Amino acid sequence: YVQAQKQFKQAEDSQNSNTLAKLGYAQCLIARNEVGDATIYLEKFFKENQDSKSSEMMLLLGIIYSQSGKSYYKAII
Amino acid sequence: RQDYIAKVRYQNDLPAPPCPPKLLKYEIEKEAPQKEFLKDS
Numbered sequence: 001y002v003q004a005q006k007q008f009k010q011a012e013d014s015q016n017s018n019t020l021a022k023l024g025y026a027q028c029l030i031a032r033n034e035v036g037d038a039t040i041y042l043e044k045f046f047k048e049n050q051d052s053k054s055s056e057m058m059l060l061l062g063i064i065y066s067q068s069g070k071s072y073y074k075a076i077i
Numbered sequence: 078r079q080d081y082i083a084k085v086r087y088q089n090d091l092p093a094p095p096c097p098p099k100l101l102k103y104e105i106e107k108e109a110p111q112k113e114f115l116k117d118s
Contacts (some may be wrong), residue, residue: 005101060115067111 001031019054026060039064 004048008025011018022045029038042061087108 027116030112061112064083064106 004028010074015059019049019052023054024058035064035067039068047048 005025005028008021010030011021012025015021022041026038026042026045029041042057042064046057046061062075065071103108
């Protein structure tokens with residue numbers, strides 16, 4: 001998980017257009033049980049890329065917000 | 078005062094507990110299946 005997350009970070013630094021690398025980075029953050037860091041990273045990516053049609057990212061955001069509970073409206077959206 | 082006999086008693090009695098049927102949590106409502114599902118390749 002640490003090595004895969006580092007490789008995803010290097011891929012992101014090499015080419016920022018690789019959305020799959022950033023989503024895998026978020027998945028690796030989930031793998032290391034870093035729920036809060038993954039949530040902050042996902043919020044940053046969504047606010048920077050509001051026009052991106054990353055359906056799985058929005059599904060993961062909805063699941064995370066449902067787990068949090070207080071952000072239920074964002075989960076609905 | 079010899080007049081009409083009538084009693085006034087406000088009714089604010091609390092009802093009995095309803096005990097409704099309990100919902101069953103989904104598989105995705107537990108942390109370990111969530112971890113298995115999100116970490117899918």
